[PDB]
Write a protein that binds this ligand. Structure first.
Ligand SMILES: *[C@@H]1O[C@H](CO)[C@@H](O[C@@H]2O[C@H](CO)[C@@H](O[C@@H]3O[C@H](CO[C@H]4O[C@H](CO)[C@@H](O)[C@H](O[C@H]5O[C@H](CO)[C@@H](O)[C@H](O)[C@@H]5O[C@H]5O[C@H](CO)[C@@H](O)[C@H](O)[C@@H]5O)[C@@H]4O)[C@@H](O)[C@H](O[C@H]4O[C@H](CO)[C@@H](O)[C@H](O)[C@@H]4O[C@H]4O[C@H](CO)[C@@H](O)[C@H](O)[C@@H]4O)[C@@H]3O)[C@H](O)[C@H]2NC(C)=O)[C@H](O)[C@H]1NC(C)=O
Ligand SMILES: O=C(c1cnc(N[C@@H]2Cc3ccc(Cl)cc3C2)nc1)N1CCC12COC2
Ligand SMILES: [Ca+2]
Ligand SMILES: [Ca+2]
Ligand SMILES: [Cl-]
Ligand SMILES: [K+]
Ligand code: NA
Ligand SMILES: [Zn+2]
Length: 804
């Protein structure tokens, strides 16, 4: 119940929302059908449009008008945005030369530069170049300010997940807005684009920027705008709030535009009809900048121009139907479109079986345009699993396609030509970032970055301490002239042991065998290798720090160094450098099944071969590859029981190709590489390192835990004329987190030679170093000659394998 008989007089676009049944006058009241009776008359004035004209200059103030051209308008803060241009001979902001903003130039009584976020729905990254001729205001922001070529959204690349990620710095799985449509089984309630339930606060987790600001004494404008409020009025409202007295004026504001998304869905991303929406958005930016200029705020405010996601060509005819794969199609509920989520229609149906659904959807048609996954098997870079609102069964849909349950769903709902929602590495889903203002750099291009990072930066721009989030604070310091955040490296929690030779061969009863029963020059030489004489070649960036309490040993060898966990009975990490000149060799016949006890490590803290023999499903591989040994004598080190890890035979096909072929290929292409490899255990799919008591699978009959994933971090010199091991400058990295699966069902062409499918798998499971850090509790690149913020940027880099 709204008692809509109250009034909005003196209350138009009030910042504090009032409680029912009192009627509302805020920028969202329309959306709740809760505005006072006189809201439209008083607060949504339209009379005479949005622009001054020569004939209105110096007019008598008529309070009916949308905006004002009277002499008093500037001090009242309600001039049309083009007032000084039409009536005082000033230039539009866009026509002025760019001039560096070295310091904020603010009116008296401003405590900090305000921040205005100008958010545009569906603004694909390539619009900045492709629409540059029709967007002169945006192009001035872009060229004069700080810009990225693109900004990566989160998955799913839908509106609400991305807007809320912008607000919180959180992955969708953590903030809880995991799609534009959702069912929460704990609440037994649904969230939809239309309707009321989405306004309930229990959907929205973490702490959005407006709440962070308010809690720390920084006033905020309301970020959400009812659809019917025209853009011109949103801009005039922001400019009016900026004219409030010091103790009432917000420091942070957001504008939102439903364009170009709205048109993009109708016409496709580059439909000829798209030119006008882009023009109109530019015009709106121009109104804001002219408005700020009139108020003497154009060299005071920091402006961010940002999108939520891009837009792809998608038509009705590119729909896959689940009714073409499943006989039982009426026993499931599908969330459809550019992703798929499946659950049982009825929780009372005991016959429903996700395994049988997954198998009926796996590699069934030759050009099949979706791939099913249990959510825990999705690429870890998506961070899309740890929420009860994410259904166990997920369909990753190819770009340009839709999935639906039955054909009747698609013609009883062609209309549309654009959509979005796909994997966040897809080029067409990328969006924009420009920062302009005293706190941003001048005429500076920055590399692409993820939208999860922006919350920290917005907090930096406002002098706020961010709530805990998934950004890496400091990784965007290179965007900023000042207000940088200067983090310290986390402290190492566990120091390593450095064991020497402590065990005789006959103390080991591991069931292992090796044909290895085979000189003072080379006896001293190998002792020095065991004490760490080559460690500077193979450990280029320092040893990784262990950020949790555990017991581990550093093990040195000729060709590799490892941090060996006494708790998990395997390395946490193995580090080695392969030069451009390195040779690949085979595993000699006499060593095929060789596993050797490590006399530095107790039998009790070692794996054993008999467990692998007994376990009919599980085999083993090596972290440092025997294929890349520096010499026949050094190769023996690769067969130590301390370099062994559990591997399903299906995974060994992947791993062996990586080790035998791809490492050398990368060393050839990049002028040497340093590789750090290791296991990951994430049985609860939260993206974080499991403790021992979370492990769900062991090698049969043993205490040897089975990894859920294997990582590798492959680092070289960004200047590829310098070898990886003698690099003076910035680094280059690529990483992966491969799922450790007992089949290759994920790869539809896996019956073919590994040269036709392994690399494609590895690209799909590309990762950030930071993702590996979360998953392992390790901190990498501790000892470089580079600035810590630069290393933070490096750790957030994702190699996407998309063309330009
Ligand atoms: C991305 O960044 C984020 C933010 O930093 C990281 O997420 C954090 O991860 C922490 C570790 O998992 C997690 O810490 C737990 O918090 C529990 C208290 O949580 C409430 O309060 C906070 C603070 O205000 C609030 O933010 C939380 O919000 C979550 O839940 C509400 C629903 O209630 C949602 O609206 C909201 O969206 C958010 O959901 C997300 O997180 C929860 C988990 O908290 C998930 O379940 C959801 O799916 C979704 O992802 C909460 O309202 C606290 O109780 C936990 O403490 C237990 O564990 C410790 C281990 O040390 C143990 O010692 C304690 O005894 C305790 O265990 C007891 O409870 C267990 C569970 O019932 C029980 O099994 C035991 O037997 C024990 O009795 C824990 O500290 C933190 O909450 C989240 N924060 C957020 C915002 O998500 C995230 O990890 C980053 N991701 C990556 C990949 O790096
Ligand atoms: O209703 C809105 C809408 C959306 N977003 C906003 N505002 C944005 C929120 C937000 C979050 C973070 C940042 Cl940094 C900026 C902004 C501005 N306003 C309205 N949409 C979206 C689809 C519908 C529902 O009906 C149409
Ligand atoms: Ca959107
Ligand atoms: Ca975990
Ligand atoms: Cl969705
Ligand atoms: K076996
Ligand atoms: Na296969
Ligand atoms: Zn859309």
């Amino acid at each position: 119940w709204t008692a809509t008989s109250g009034s909005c007089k003196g209350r138009c676009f009030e910042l504090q929302e009032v409680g029912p049944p009192d009627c509302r006058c805020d920028n969202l009241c329309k959306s709740y059908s809760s505005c006072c009776h006189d809201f439209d008359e008083l607060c949504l004035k339209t009379a005479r449009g949005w622009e001054c004209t020569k004939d209105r200059c110096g007019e008598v103030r008529n309070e009916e008008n949308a905006c004002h051209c009277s002499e008093d308008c500037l001090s009242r803060g309600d001039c049309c945005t083009n007032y000084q241009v039409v009536c005082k001979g000033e230039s539009h902001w866009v026509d002025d030369d760019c001039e560096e903003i070295k310091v904020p130039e603010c009116p008296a009584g401003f405590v900090r530069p305000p921040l205005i976020i100008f958010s545009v729905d569906g603004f694909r990254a390539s619009y900045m170049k492709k629409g540059s001729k029709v967007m002169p205001n945006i192009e001035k922001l872009r060229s004069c300010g700080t810009h990225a070529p693109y900004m990566r959204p989160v998955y799913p690349t839908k509106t609400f997940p991305n807007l809320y990620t912008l607000a919180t710095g959180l992955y969708p799985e953590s903030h809880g807005i995991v799609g534009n449509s959702m069912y929460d089984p704990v609440f037994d309630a649904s969230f939809h684009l239309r309707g009321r339930e989405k306004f309930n606060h229990r959907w929205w987790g973490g702490q959005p920027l407006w709440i962070t600001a308010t809690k720390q004494g920084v006033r905020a404008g309301t970020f959400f705008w009812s659809v019917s409020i025209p853009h011109e009025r949103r801009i005039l409202t922001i400019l009016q709030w900026l004219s409030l007295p010091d103790n009432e004026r917000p420091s942070v504001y957001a504008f939102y535009s439903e364009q170009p998304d709205f048109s993009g869905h109708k016409y496709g991303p580059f439909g000829p009809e798209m030119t006008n929406p882009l023009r109109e958005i530019d015009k709106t930016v121009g109104q804001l900048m002219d408005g700020l200029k009139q108020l003497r705020l154009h060299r005071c405010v920091n402006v961010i121009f940002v999108g939520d996601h891009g837009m792809e060509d998608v038509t009705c005819d590119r729909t896959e139907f689940l009714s073409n794969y499943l006989t039982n199609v009426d026993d499931i509920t599908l969330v459809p479109g550019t992703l798929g989520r499946i659950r049982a229609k009825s929780i009372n149906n005991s016959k429903y079986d996700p395994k049988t659904i997954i198998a009926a959807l796996t590699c069934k048609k030759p050009d099949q345009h979706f791939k099913p996954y249990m959510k825990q098997h999705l690429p870890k870079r998506l961070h899309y699993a740890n929420n009860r609102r994410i259904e166990d069964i997920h369909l990753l849909v190819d770009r340009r396609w839709h999935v639906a349950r039955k054909p009747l769903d698609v013609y009883k709902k062609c209309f549309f030509q654009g959509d979005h929602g796909f994997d966040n590495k897809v080029n067409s889903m990328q969006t924009v970032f420009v920062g302009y203002g005293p706190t941003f750099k001048y005429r500076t291009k920055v590399p692409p970055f993820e939208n999860i990072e922006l919350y920290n930066v917005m907090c930096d721009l406002l002098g706020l301490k961010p709530a805990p989030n998934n950004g890496t604070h400091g990784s965007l310091n290179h965007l900023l002239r000042t207000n940088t955040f200067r983090p310290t490296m986390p402290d190492e929690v566990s120091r390593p042991n450095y064991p020497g030779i402590m065990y005789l061969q006959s103390e080991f009863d591991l069931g292992c065998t090796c044909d290895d029963k085979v000189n003072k020059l080379e006896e001293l030489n190998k002792r020095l290798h065991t004490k760490g004489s080559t460690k500077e070649r193979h450990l280029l960036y320092g040893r990784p720090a262990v950020l949790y309490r555990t017991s581990y040993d550093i093990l040195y060898h000729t060709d590799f160094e490892s941090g060996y966990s006494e708790i998990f009975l395997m390395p946490l990490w193995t580090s080695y450098t392969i030069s451009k000149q390195a040779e690949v060799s085979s595993i000699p016949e006499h060593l095929t099944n060789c596993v050797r006890p490590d006399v530095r490590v107790s039998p009790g803290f070692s794996q054993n071969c008999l467990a692998y023999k007994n376990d009919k499903q599980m085999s083993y591989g090596f972290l440092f590859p025997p294929y890349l040994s520096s010499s026949p004598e050094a190769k023996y080190d690769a067969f130590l029981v301390t370099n062994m890890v559990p591997m399903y035979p299906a995974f060994k096909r992947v791993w062996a190709y990586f080790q035998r072929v791809l490492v050398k290929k990368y060393a050839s292409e990049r002028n040497g590489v340093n590789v750090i490899s290791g296991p990951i255990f994430d049985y609860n799919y939260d993206g974080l390192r499991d403790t021992e008591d979370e492990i769900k699978q062991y090698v049969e009959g043993s205490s040897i835990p089975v990894p859920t994933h294997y990582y590798s971090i492959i680092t070289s010199c960004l200047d590829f004329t310098q070898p990886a091991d003698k690099c003076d400058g910035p680094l280059s990295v690529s990483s992966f987190i491969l799922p450790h699966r007992p089949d290759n069902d994920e790869s539809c062409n896996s019956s073919e030679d590994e040269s036709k499918w392994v690399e494609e798998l590895m690209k799909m499971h590309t990762a950030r170093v930071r993702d590996i850090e979360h998953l392992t509790g390790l901190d990498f690149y501790r000892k470089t000659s580079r600035s810590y913020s630069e290393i933070l940027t490096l750790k957030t880099y994702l190699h996407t394998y998309e063309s330009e």
